[PDB]
Design a protein around this ligand. Structure first.
Ligand SMILES: Nc1nc2c(ncn2[C@@H]2O[C@H](COP(=O)(O)OP(=O)(O)O)[C@@H](O)[C@H]2O)c(=O)[nH]1
Length: 171
C-alpha cells in the first residue's frame, strides 16, 4: 500500500497567465479557449516513491482565506508578457506575508507554445528561480507540456518537507 499525503496548494500569478488553464489541464486533461470557470481536486500517484497525494488546488479578507493552510504553490507568469514576469516577486511576497512563513514554490513559465510572441527568455526565469532555490518549469496548458511535471515536482518537495517535519518531531 502506498503512503498517503494531502496538501492544499495555491496557483499564483497575474490575470490571464494561465492559472485556470493549467489547473484544467492537470485535473481534467484538456484545453479549451472557451472554458468557463474555490478549488479543484486531483489525486496523484507517484510511483518512484509509492506515494499517493490528494491535492486541493486553489485559484483566485478573501486573500487571507485563499492562502490559509497552503503547503505549496505554483508561481506562474506568461512568457509573452514581461509585466507578469516582473510581478511574480510580488506574488511570492504576498503569499509569504499572508502565511507568515515560506512555502515551496515552483516557478512556472507558461504559454511557451507561443514561440513567436515570447519575450521572457528561459534564462531569465531560471535565474529568478535559482536565486530563491525554487525549481523552474516551462509549461503549456494548451499542449500539456510539463504541466503534470510541475505539479508532481511540487508534490515531491512537499512530501520531503513532511518527512523533514516527521524527523524534527521525533528527536
Ligand atoms: N497558447 C496558450 N494559451 C494559453 C495557455 N494557457 C492559458 N492560455 C490562454 O490564455 C488565456 C488566459 O488563461 P486563464 O486560464 O484564463 O488564465 P488565469 O486568468 O490566470 O486563470 C485564455 O485565453 C487561455 O485559453 C497556454 O499554455 N498556451
Amino acid at each position: 500500500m502506498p503512503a498517503e499525503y494531502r496538501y492544499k496548494i495555491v496557483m499564483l500569478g497575474d490575470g490571464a497567465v494561465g492559472k485556470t488553464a493549467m489547473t484544467t489541464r492537470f485535473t481534467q486533461n484538456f484545453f479549451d479557449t472557451d472554458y468557463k470557470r474555490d478549488f479543484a481536486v486531483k489525486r496523484l500517484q507517484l510511483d518512484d516513491i509509492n506515494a499517493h497525494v490528494t491535492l486541493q488546488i486553489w485559484d483566485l479578507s478573501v486573500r487571507q482565506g485563499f492562502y490559509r493552510g497552503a503547503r505549496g504553490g505554483l508561481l506562474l507568469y506568461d512568457v509573452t508578457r514581461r509585466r507578469t514576469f516582473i510581478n511574480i516577486e510580488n506574488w511570492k511576497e504576498e503569499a509569504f506575508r499572508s502565511l507568515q512563513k515560506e512555502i515551496p514554490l515552483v516557478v512556472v513559465a507558461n504559454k511557451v507554445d507561443l514561440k513567436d510572441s515570447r519575450v521572457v527568455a528561459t534564462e531569465e526565469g531560471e535565474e529568478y528561480a535559482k536565486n530563491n532555490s525554487f525549481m523552474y518549469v516551462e509549461s503549456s496548458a494548451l499542449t500539456g507540456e510539463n504541466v503534470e511535471e510541475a505539479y508532481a515536482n511540487l508534490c515531491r518537495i512537499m512530501i520531503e518537507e513532511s518527512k523533514d517535519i516527521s524527523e524534527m518531531t521525533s528527536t
